[PDB]
Design a protein around this ligand. Structure first.
Ligand SMILES: Cc1cc2nc3c(=O)[nH]c(=O)nc-3n(C[C@H](O)[C@H](O)[C@H](O)COP(=O)(O)OP(=O)(O)OC[C@H]3O[C@@H](n4cnc5c(N)ncnc54)[C@H](O)[C@@H]3O)c2cc1C
Ligand SMILES: [Ca+2]
Length: 420
């Protein structure tokens, strides 16, 4: 009503607030630091970078590169701060963390339409409100969210298995079927006893992580994620010794995860192991497995592609809380949530970028992905439609970059009111 609330002044909240301010909407920005600190933060600055100083690859074949370009086109404060705080990095956008957060803090605090409240928010603020409290959302607010939307719709940890691009799978080595109690729609990669022997040992030499389960017993994976019972390999007419199952994560079916392969392994180790699996020898991993302390919402059950809560008009989520991972992804979802909150205040319906753009692909995934055990997502090429034709993958990716950027730009140009 009076000011739009933004809760959390991290990557997402800072961009959401800036977007609101640019559109002339008064903001009340809550930040608990430094009255209360998270386990990861060390300063009282807005948009503090808590770990790596990289915002991702800048290249035209890089999905993060496309998102960076989109955010610049959008006039992002995070991208402005990043460009001005650049430090050397081959192919990646990397920043002087202190200069980055210092600049953002000064530009926001200096804005006449911004009120900053240095307090912990313990209940969802009434009115028009963007929640952007991040992976270390205070326990009070996490509790409040559980009370409002359901215990099972907020997680405190992620445990994500690797997701591969469907088109990169050798389907001649797989079969579609389900075990007892499963959908008949899982993809099954059968393995012989000898193949399992080598795979098990590889896991040892590389929620409980799958590699740890393997360490605990030879048969543990065979009772669990690699269980073959109730499956018949059409090729042999027999039950396989073991399988790796894949399940569809996205609505479009471009993105399939390895079932029960949540892992904390280094990304290069994950790639090497995955490519041992029959059918996945040349698989392209678009989202690597991780296991982190990470508070986030079940976006597919709770949020629209507009980042507005489906059952709470004028309430939005952005950043890690909304189900993304990455500084840039958090800033970008902050932009969209701030944009839609501003539009709401003004009496205009919410918007979302096209499925061809990286931000559009990201938020559409959040809203439409498989809700069961939903895990966070970062920018990747699986999120957008393929490029048809018989070109090389590099050329195809460049085409997806150009197509997405043009589509995002056209979308921006159509906005009324326009971003100044
Ligand atoms: C340990 C760790 C390392 C990470 N390393 C990387 C990395 O290397 N690269 C990468 O891309 N991403 C990394 N991330 C993941 C993620 O991209 C970042 O956490 C990113 O900053 C998320 O942006 P955000 O705005 O959603 O959350 P944050 O930047 O954490 O901002 C949330 C803000 O909300 C505040 N807040 C929380 N609760 C309340 C409350 N109730 N009231 C008021 N304020 C509140 C917090 O103090 C914080 O300022 C890391 C995360 C963690 C936890
Ligand atoms: Ca500089």
């Amino acid at each position: 009503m009076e000011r739009v609330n933004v809760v959390g002044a991290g990557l997402a909240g800072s961009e959401a607030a800036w977007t609101l301010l640019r559109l002339g909407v008064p903001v009340r920005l809550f930040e608990m630091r430094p009255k209360r600190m998270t386990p990861a933060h060390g300063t009282d600055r807005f948009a503090e970078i808590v770990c790596s100083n990289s915002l991702g690859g800048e290249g035209e074949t890089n999905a993060k590169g496309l998102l960076q370009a989109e955010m610049r086109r959008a006039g992002s404060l995070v991208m402005e701060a990043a460009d001005l705080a650049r430090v050397p990095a081959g192919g990646a956008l990397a920043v002087d963390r202190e200069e980055f957060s210092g600049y953002i803090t000064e530009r926001l605090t200096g804005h006449p339409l911004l009120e900053v409240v240095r307090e912990e928010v313990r209940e969802i603020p009434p009115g028009i409100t963007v929640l952007a409290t991040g992976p270390l959302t205070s326990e009070a607010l996490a509790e409040a969210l559980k009370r409002r939307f359901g215990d099972h719709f907020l997680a405190y940890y992620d445990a994500a298995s690797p997701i591969v691009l469907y088109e990169s799978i050798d389907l001649t080595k797989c079969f579609r079927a389900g075990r007892y109690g499963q959908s008949a729609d899982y993809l099954n990669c059968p393995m012989t006893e000898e193949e399992y022997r080598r795979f098990h040992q590889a896991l040892l030499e590389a929620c409980v992580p799958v590699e740890e389960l393997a360490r605990r017993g030879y048969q543990t994976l065979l009772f669990g994620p690699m269980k073959p019972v109730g499956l018949v390999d059409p090729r042999t007419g027999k039950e396989p010794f073991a399988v790796v199952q894949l399940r569809q994560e996205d609505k479009a079916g471009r993105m399939w995860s390895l079932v029960g392969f949540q892992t904390g392994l280094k990304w290069p180790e994950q790639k090497r192991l995955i490519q041992m699996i029959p059918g996945l020898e040349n698989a392209e991993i678009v989202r690597y497995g991780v296991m982190h302390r990470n508070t986030y919402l079940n976006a597919p059950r709770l949020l629209g592609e507009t980042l507005e809560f489906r059952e709470a008009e004028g309430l939005y989520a952005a950043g890690v809380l909304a189900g993304v991972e990455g500084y840039l992804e958090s800033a970008a979802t902050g932009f969209l949530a701030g944009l839609n909150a501003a539009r709401k205040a003004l009496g205009l319906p919410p918007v979302a970028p096209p499925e061809e753009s990286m931000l559009g692909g990201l938020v559409r995934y959040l809203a439409t992905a498989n809700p069961e055990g939903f895990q966070p997502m970062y920018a990747n090429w699986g999120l957008v439609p393929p490029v048809e034709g018989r070109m090389g993958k590099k050329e195809k990716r460049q085409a997806m970059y150009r197509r997405g950027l043009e589509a995002f730009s056209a979308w921006l140009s159509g906005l009324n009111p326009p971003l100044p």
